[PDB]
Design a protein around this nucleic acid. Sequence first.
DNA 1: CGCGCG
DNA 2: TCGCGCG
Lengths: 64, 67
Amino acid sequence: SPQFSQQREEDIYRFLKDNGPQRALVIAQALGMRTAKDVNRDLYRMKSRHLLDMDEQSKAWTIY
Amino acid sequence: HMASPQFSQQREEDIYRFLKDNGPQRALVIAQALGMRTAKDVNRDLYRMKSRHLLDMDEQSKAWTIY
DNA sequence: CGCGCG
DNA sequence: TCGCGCG
């Protein structure tokens, strides 16, 4: 199973599981926030833990 | 008969005076010299002053100068 | 405008 | 590549 330190990481993961790959502004807005900056530190931390991947060209995030 | 340049903020006048006497210098140096902590404390102001042609930045050294 | 950086 | 100025 994926290991989440904060429940909000699961919220991101499930959003991407449910809706396919999306940019950080979409993850943020879907979860009640505004911009990529509201979630990017979480996304890159999750990427470092092989929870998510990002396509560097489209900037879309997806589950790992 | 007013002095030149005119600065809209004390911060801008302080940056300009620091660079006139010491410059060029990196943003991290300017931030510390004005009692702040990192480049993030002055970058918004430096690029705004650059857009008004009050300062320039050397791309190679990253040091800011009075224009 | 990508920015992940405390 | 800590470059980053971004609201």
